Design a protein around this nucleic acid. Structure first.
Ligand SMILES: [Mg+2]
Ligand SMILES: [Mg+2]
Lengths: 248, 254
DNA sequence: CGAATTCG
DNA sequence: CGAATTCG
């Protein structure tokens, strides 16, 4: 039984950022996941996390601008190595952050990314997805591979990409496509961007590769759904809280 | 003349009537071009009502068929005496946001029946989807024409090459005149901000926005030449249009 | 998001 | 044009 949260926390939004960061961590404190994947972390946000989540090992995708991070719960997760794979043609400083870890006997390659944003960068987003899927295949078979991140994907783009390979699963699809946590970016329910029109997207996704039935999603839920004292949410994205069993 | 009676000749040209600056002088530039080559047919886009008046003054030997009466629109000009006007047909583009439509004029010329078509397909990269849908409407219409009739579309398609592919490519019996003549380089680009200054765009981009499609029974319509027109600066130091026009001649064969 | 607006 | 930006 292992748990993580993946969450684009919108560090690029400077308004109410200190309060929203604290809001994010209040959410993290409630669930105490083994692993936290974050996207759109900025340096002072990261600095705050290093103090606030001092009980997590913090691995970052970059030092400047905005970048991903992977938080690993000390005592639960043994950090073995980090790897960063570039997206050579990204225009948004995106890359692929991987950590090799273990939880006791089980080896994991945990991956996150913030794939190229916006409709017009579809082709590069798809190339980045291919890089990600390629990397998921490289780990030893006994290694459990989990990608969790902000993919900015449209369904049609996954199809263009050839679809997920037979040995790679979407945790949300695996759980039967539950409706309550389908959309992770929802301008009807989320007012942070002040977007009048209603758009709902499943941008944040979880892919996994495991030996037959060795990794079994148990639950998937949205987090960060409560307004803070400033009347806004921690992020324009909802986070995904996922629990999975490792079954040998 | 008798020898050339087998040849149909036309110009298609987006004459940028939306640019009101130097418009009368630029209209005179376009009309000087028409007088020079005396085409049988002229397909225009971005005509506005004042521009119609200029045409009636400086291109008086042409009958004008317009795509609308107000705002801006296309026109097909028919050389009096050479072309017999049979009917005007307009197909709406229900989803246009730019009042675009499909203007068809049925005529006889040189002893042959023609359906002449023009359009100003939805502009800009952003409206690609709608432009593609309009292209499909155009292509469908070309195919709907009776097999006896010779179908020529010539207009401002605003097309990117990849959009035609996305559309499925041209249908089997429909040919692009430029392609048919072997993609000659000299008239490849009809809109070129490097060579054309009218829009004062401080960058170099060029496109083959303006295109000629034709459908004919095999061998019966043979493109003979394709050339650009409108590449001379006028007195005001600007071109007749931000587009170059296309001059095309085709033979109708037995 | 995505239409609108400037910027070169 | 196409990129960068704005803002609801
Ligand atoms: Mg964002
Ligand atoms: Mg124009």
């Amino acid at each position: 039984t292992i748990s993580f949260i993946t969450w684009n926390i919108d560090g690029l939004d400077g308004c109410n950022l200190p309060e929203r960061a604290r809001g994010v961590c209040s959410c993290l404190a409630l669930y105490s996941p083994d692993v936290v994947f974050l996207q759109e972390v900025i340096p002072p946000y990261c600095a705050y996390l290093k103090k606030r989540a001092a009980s997590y090992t913090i691995i970052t995708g970059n030092e400047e601008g905005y970048f991903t991070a992977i938080l690993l719960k000390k005592g639960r997760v043994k950090f073995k190595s980090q790897e960063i794979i570039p997206f050579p043609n990204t225009k948004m400083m995106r890359n692929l952050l991987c950590v090799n870890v273990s939880l006791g006997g089980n080896e994991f390659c945990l991956m996150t990314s913030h794939l190229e944003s916006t409709r017009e960068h579809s082709a590069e987003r798809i190339r980045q997805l291919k890089t990600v899927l390629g990397k998921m295949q490289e780990a030893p078979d006994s290694t459990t591979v989990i990608f969790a991140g902000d993919t900015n994907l449209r369904d049609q783009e996954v199809i263009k990409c050839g679809g997920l390979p037979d040995n790679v699963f979407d945790a949300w699809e695996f759980l039967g496509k539950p409706k309550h946590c389908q959309y992770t970016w929802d301008t009807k329910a989320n007012n942070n961007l002040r977007i009048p029109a209603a758009y709902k997207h499943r941008f944040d996704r979880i892919f996994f590769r495991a030996e037959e039935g060795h990794l079994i999603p148990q639950s998937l839920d949205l987090v960060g759904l409560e307004k803070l004292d400033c009347g806004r949410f921690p992020s324009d994205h909802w986070g995904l809280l996922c629990t999975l069993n490792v079954v040998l």
